[PDB]
C-alpha cells in the first residue's frame, strides 16, 4: 500500500445507499411512463437502473455524442441538475410522434436536434419534470424549472470541477422493440443538505411528528453536562525553554482582560474573571455566537 | 537535538466546571459562573491539551505573571487522570 | 374511433374480464384488430371470456366508463392519415430513371 | 447456550394472546362477509387464521409481489396500519364484478392494478374499513381513514425498523371454488397502549362500572405505606478511601440547601430539613411532579 | 398522579396458631391455613390488602387474575378472626 | 443554537453486582448484564441517556438506528433498578 | 481597497503526534497525516485557512483549483481535533 | 531533561505563492492558481510553522504522508526567509 501519490488520482470513495432517492426514482419512473403513454399514445416500460455515485468526468465520459442535456433548477437547493435525453430515445419519440410506427431500424448517425426535435424534447422534458416534482413532493416539495439545453458535455460543466462527485440515475425505456435510455444527473452537493433524508425512508407519519421528535430531542439533550475550560492566559515559548524550565520560574504574560470559555477547544463565551465563595468564577459578558 | 527550538504553545486554564445545556443556554448578561478552582489554588498549565505544570499568579512589578509552583510528575498525571 | 394499436397498448395491462368488457362495446372491426395485436394466450383468454360473458354490474360499468373518459380526456387523437402509399409511388414516377430504379430496388430489398 | 451474539439476530420473543383482538377479528370477518355478499352478490366465507406476532421484515418477506397495500389511520392511536389485498382476491373480485362468473382458472402472472382495478380495490377497502370500525366499536371506538395504496412492501415501510415487532391477521376467503387471502397488519406499537384491553375480553357490563372499579382501586390503594428515604448529602469517594476509611474521619460535603425525598430511589419531593419534637423533620417545598 | 413503584404481594391464606406447633415444626410437618381451597387469594399493596383474585398459571409462571376489589365490611370481617 | 461537540456513547446494558465476582473475574469468566438480548441499546449524551435504538452493522462497522426517544417515566423506571 | 501582497499557502493536511516518532524520524520513516487522500487541500492566507480546493498539475507545476470557501462551522470543526 | 511526552503539531505544505489583494478578489469559483514549487519537488514538513524536513508526497492506504529526504540542516535557512 506504499505507493507514491500522484495528482488526478480521484480515489473518491464515498459509499452510501439513498433509499429515498431510489423511491423517488421509482415514483418518477411511473409518472414518466404514464406521461409517455399520454403523449405517444403507446405504453412504454421504464426500468430504473442502479444509482451511480460517480465523478462528473467519469459520468460525462460515458455520455454518447451528440445528446440532449437539459439544465434544471432544484429550488430552493442551491445549484442546478441535468436531464440527459439520449439520441435513440429522441429518435424513437419523434418517429412515433410524426407518423412513423417505429418498425423501421433506428439509424442514429450523430447529428444535432432540429427545432422540431427541440420542441419534442421540450415536451418530453416538461412531462419528466412534472413527474419528477410529483415523485419528490412525497418526501420534499420543490420547484423544478427548465434552464436551457445543450448538445455537448462541455457546454454544461455541471460541477465546479470534473472530479466532483455526482449522482446519476439511468432509466431504460422500451416501447415494443425500440429501446432507449434517459438519465438524471444531480450533483452530490445538491443532496448533501438532505443526505440524511435520502439515506433512509423509514417514516410515513411525519408532519407534526417530526416537530414532536425534534422537541423531545432538544428537551432530552438539555440534560447533558459539558466541559468548560477557561484559558486564563497564553504564553508562547520554545522547546529549549520548556526543557530547561524549572519550578519557581515566572513567565511574562500579557494581561488577559477577557477570558474565553471553551469546550473541547470550542469557544463558548467571553467573560471576566473573579473570586466568589473562595473559588474562581466567571461573569459572562458575551456568549460565542456568530 | 535539532528540536531545541520547536515553537510551542503554552496555555493555562482558569478552572473547570460540571454544567449542562439548560443553564448553558440560560447564561445571560452579567451572569456569574463559578469554577472548581479555589481562589489561591495554583492554576493548571497545559500544552496541546496535556499537563505540563501548575503555576500561580504572582505580582511582578505591576506585571502579573505565572510562577511555576511545581513541575508535573507521572504519578500526578495518573492521579489527575 | 382511435387506432387499434394504441388501443391494444392501453388495454394489454387491463384485467382480462375488463378487456372483454371493453371489446364488447366497440365496433367489431376495432375489436378484431385489437385482438390481432395481443399475444396468443391473452387473446385466447379474452375470447373465451367474451364467449362466457355473464354480465357486468352497472356501477362497475359506470366506474370503468368514467376511468376511460378521464384517461382519454386528452384533447383529440385524430391521427392524420394524409399521405403514404399512392403518394410515394407517384413521387417515384417523377424521378430520373436511375434514381427511381435504385429506389425500387431498395424497396424490394426492404 | 454459550454462543457469541451477532447483530441482526432479532430473537424477539414477545409472546401474548390477544383474545380481544381475536374477537374484533371475528366480528370484522362477519361484517366483511356480509359486505362482500352485498357487493359481489355472492356469498363468501371468511376464515380468520392465527394471529402472527412477527417482525415486520419477516411479515413482508412472505408477501407476494405485486400486492395491494393500503395505509390506514387508527385514530386516535399514533401511527398507521395496513390492509393487504392479495392479487388472487382482487382478481376474483374484479372477475365476479365485471361479468366473469369465476369458473375460469385464475391466472395471476404479476402485474400492477389498473385504475378500474384500483376503484374495485377502493370499494372493497371501504367496506373492509367500515366493518373493522364496526367490530372495534364494541371494545374501543376508533376512526379509520384511508391514506394511500402501494404495490411494493418497500413503498410502505410500516415500522421504524424492519425488525420491529408487528401484528398480522390473515383471512382466507372462499367463494365457490375461488380462494383468496387478505391480511390486516398493525404494528405492535399501535396496540401497546391498549395491550391490557386486547389480552383479555372478560368484561361486558363496563361503561360506568369501569369508573366505579377505578375509584374503588384508588380509594383502596390510598391505604398503602411507603418508604421515604431523604438523602441528606452526597459525597463522591474512591475505593482506596473506602478501604482505608476509619471512624472519626470527617468527609467534606457541599451544603445541601434542599433535601430530596425519594422512595426506592424514586424522587418524591424537595424539602428543607430541620428538627421538631427532637426528631429530624422535612418541610416540603415542592413535590416531584413533571 | 404519582409514579411510585410498590411491592405488590399475593397471600395464600392466614393461620392463627400458638408457637406449640411452631417449635414442633420440621420438614414434612403438616400445616393448615385459615383459607379453604378455592377462595380467591388476597392481593396486598405494600402489605395492605386491597383485592381478591384467582390463581392461574401462565407460561409456567404464577399469576393472579383479580376477581374483585374488597369492601370495608368484608375487610374487617377478615380482620376480626 | 450552539455548535458544541459532544461525546455520544451507546451502552449495551447494565449490571448490578457486588465485587465478589469482580475480584473473581478472569479471562473467560462469564458475566450477565441486566438487559436481555433484543431490547434497544441505550444512547447516552455525555453519559446522559436520551434514546433507545437497535444495533446494526454497516460496512463492517457498528452503528445504531435510533428507534425512539425515552420518556421520564421509562427513564426513572430504568434508574430505580 | 488596499494593494498589499500576501503569502498565500496551500496545506496538504494536519498531524497530531507526540515527539516520540519525531525523534524516531529518519529518511524513509513513514508518516501519516490527518487528511485522507481525496479531500481538498487547505488554502491559507498568511497562514489563515480560508478555502478548500483540489490539487492539479499544470505545465508540470503544482496548482490548486479552489472548490469552495470555508464556513465558521467547518472551520472550528477542523480546529477542534 | 526528558520532559518529552509532549504532543506536537505537524503540517505539510504543498506549495507557497505571493499574490496581491486584487488577484485574491479576482479569484472566483473554480479558479486555479499555480504554485511556486515545480511539480515533483519535496514538500515542506512544518512544526508549528517551523521547517525542519523536506519530503515528497506519498499515499499510504489512502492516507496522506510524506517521504522525507532532508531533515536537520540550517545551511539554507538563510535562503528560505
Swiss-Prot record, chains A, D:
It is a peripheral membrane protein. InterPro entries: CheC-like_sf, Flag_FliM, FliN-like_C, SpoA-like_sf. It is found in: Cell inner membrane; Bacterial flagellum basal body. GO terms for molecular function: cytoskeletal motor activity. GO terms for biological process: bacterial-type flagellum-dependent swarming motility; positive chemotaxis. Its main location: membrane. Belongs to the FliM family. FliM is one of three proteins (FliG, FliN, FliM) that forms the rotor-mounted switch complex (C ring), located at the base of the basal body. This complex interacts with the CheY and CheZ chemotaxis proteins, in addition to contacting components of the motor that determine the direction of flagellar rotation. This is Flagellar motor switch protein FliM.
Curated annotation (Swiss-Prot), chain C:
It is found in: Cell inner membrane; Bacterial flagellum basal body. It comes from the Bacteria. A motif (Part of the EHPQR-motif) lies at residues 14-17. The record marks 49 as: Part of the EHPQR-motif. Belongs to the FliG family. FliG is one of three proteins (FliG, FliN, FliM) that forms the rotor-mounted switch complex (C ring), located at the base of the basal body. This complex interacts with the CheY and CheZ chemotaxis proteins, in addition to contacting components of the motor that determine the direction of flagellar rotation. This is Flagellar motor switch protein FliG. It comes from Salmonella typhimurium (strain LT2 / SGSC1412 / ATCC 700720). The gene is fliG.
Curated annotation (Swiss-Prot), chains E, F, G:
It is a peripheral membrane protein. This is Flagellar motor switch protein FliN. The keyword Cytoplasm does not apply. The chain holds residues 57 to 137 of 137 of the full protein. One of its GO terms (molecular function) is cytoskeletal motor activity. Belongs to the FliN/MopA/SpaO family. It is found in: Cell inner membrane; Bacterial flagellum basal body. FliN is one of three proteins (FliG, FliN, FliM) that form the rotor-mounted switch complex (C ring), located at the base of the basal body. This complex interacts with the CheY and CheZ chemotaxis proteins, in addition to contacting components of the motor that determine the direction of flagellar rotation. The keyword Acyltransferase does not apply. GO terms for biological process: bacterial-type flagellum-dependent cell motility; chemotaxis. Its main location: membrane. Keywords: Bacterial flagellum, Cell inner membrane, Cell membrane, Chemotaxis, Flagellar rotation, Membrane. One of its GO terms (cellular component) is bacterial-type flagellum basal body. It comes from Salmonella typhimurium (strain LT2 / SGSC1412 / ATCC 700720).
Amino acid at each position: 500500500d506504499i505507493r507514491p501519490y500522484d495528482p488526478n488520482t480521484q480515489r473518491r470513495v464515498v459509499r452510501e445507499r439513498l433509499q429515498a432517492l431510489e423511491i423517488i426514482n421509482e415514483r418518477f419512473a411511473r409518472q414518466f411512463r404514464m406521461g409517455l403513454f399520454n403523449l405517444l399514445r403507446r405504453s412504454p416500460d421504464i426500468t430504473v437502473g442502479a444509482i451511480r455515485i460517480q465523478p462528473y468526468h467519469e459520468f460525462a465520459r460515458n455520455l454518447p455524442v451528440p445528446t440532449n442535456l437539459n439544465l434544471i433548477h432544484l429550488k430552493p437547493l442551491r445549484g442546478t441538475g441535468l436531464v440527459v435525453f439520449s439520441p435513440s430515445l429522441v429518435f424513437i419519440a419523434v418517429d412515433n410522434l410524426f407518423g412513423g410506427d417505429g418498425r423501421f431500424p433506428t439509424k442514429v448517425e450523430g447529428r444535432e436536434f432540429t427545432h422540431t426535435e427541440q420542441r419534442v424534447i421540450n415536451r418530453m422534458l416538461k412531462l419528466a419534470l412534472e413527474g419528477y416534482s410529483d415523485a419528490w413532493k412525497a418526501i420534499n416539495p420543490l420547484e423544478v424549472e427548465y434552464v436551457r439545453s445543450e448538445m455537448q458535455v462541455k457546454f454544461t460543466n455541471i460541477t465546479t470541477s470534473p472530479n466532483d462527485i455526482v449522482v446519476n440515475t439511468p432509466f431504460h425505456v422500451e416501447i415494443g422493440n425500440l429501446t432507449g435510455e434517459f438519465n438524471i444527473c444531480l450533483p452530490f452537493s445538491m443532496i448533501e443538505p438532505l443526505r440524511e433524508l435520502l439515506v433512509n425512508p423509514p417514516l410515513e407519519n411525519s408532519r407534526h411528528e417530526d416537530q414532536n421528535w425534534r422537541d423531545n430531542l432538544v428537551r432530552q439533550v438539555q440534560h447533558s453536562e459539558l466541559e468548560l475550560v477557561a484559558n486564563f492566559a497564553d504564553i508562547p515559548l520554545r522547546l529549549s525553554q520548556i526543557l530547561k524550565l524549572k519550578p519557581g520560574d515566572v513567565l511574562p504574560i500579557e494581561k488577559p482582560d477577557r477570558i474565553i470559555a471553551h469546550v473541547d477547544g470550542v469557544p463558548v463565551l467571553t467573560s471576566q474573571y473573579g473570586t466568589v465563595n473562595g473559588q474562581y468564577a466567571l461573569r459572562v459578558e458575551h456568549l460565542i455566537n456568530p | 537535538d535539532l528540536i531545541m527550538d520547536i515553537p510551542v504553545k503554552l496555555t493555562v486554564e482558569l478552572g473547570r466546571t460540571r454544567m449542562t445545556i439548560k443553564e448553558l443556554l440560560r447564561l445571560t448578561q452579567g451572569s456569574v459562573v463559578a469554577l472548581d478552582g479555589l481562589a489561591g489554588e495554583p492554576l493548571d498549565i497545559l500544552i496541546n491539551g496535556y499537563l505540563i505544570a501548575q503555576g500561580e499568579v504572582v505580582v511582578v512589578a505591576d506585571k502579573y505573571g505565572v510562577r511555576i509552583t511545581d513541575i508535573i510528575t507521572p504519578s500526578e498525571r495518573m492521579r489527575r487522570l | 374511433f382511435m387506432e387499434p394499436q394504441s388501443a391494444a397498448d392501453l388495454i394489454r395491462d387491463e384485467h382480462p374480464q375488463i378487456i372483454a368488457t371493453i371489446l364488447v362495446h366497440l365496433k367489431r372491426s376495432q375489436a378484431a384488430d385489437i385482438l390481432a395485436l395481443f399475444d396468443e394466450r391473452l387473446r385466447h383468454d379474452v375470447m373465451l371470456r367474451i364467449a362466457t360473458f355473464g354480465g357486468v354490474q352497472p356501477a362497475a360499468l359506470a366506474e370503468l366508463t368514467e376511468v376511460l373518459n378521464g384517461l382519454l380526456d386528452g384533447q383529440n387523437l385524430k391521427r392524420s392519415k394524409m399521405g403514404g402509399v399512392r403518394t410515394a409511388a407517384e413521387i417515384i414516377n417523377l424521378m430520373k430513371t436511375q434514381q427511381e430504379e435504385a429506389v425500387i430496388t431498395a424497396v424490394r430489398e426492404f
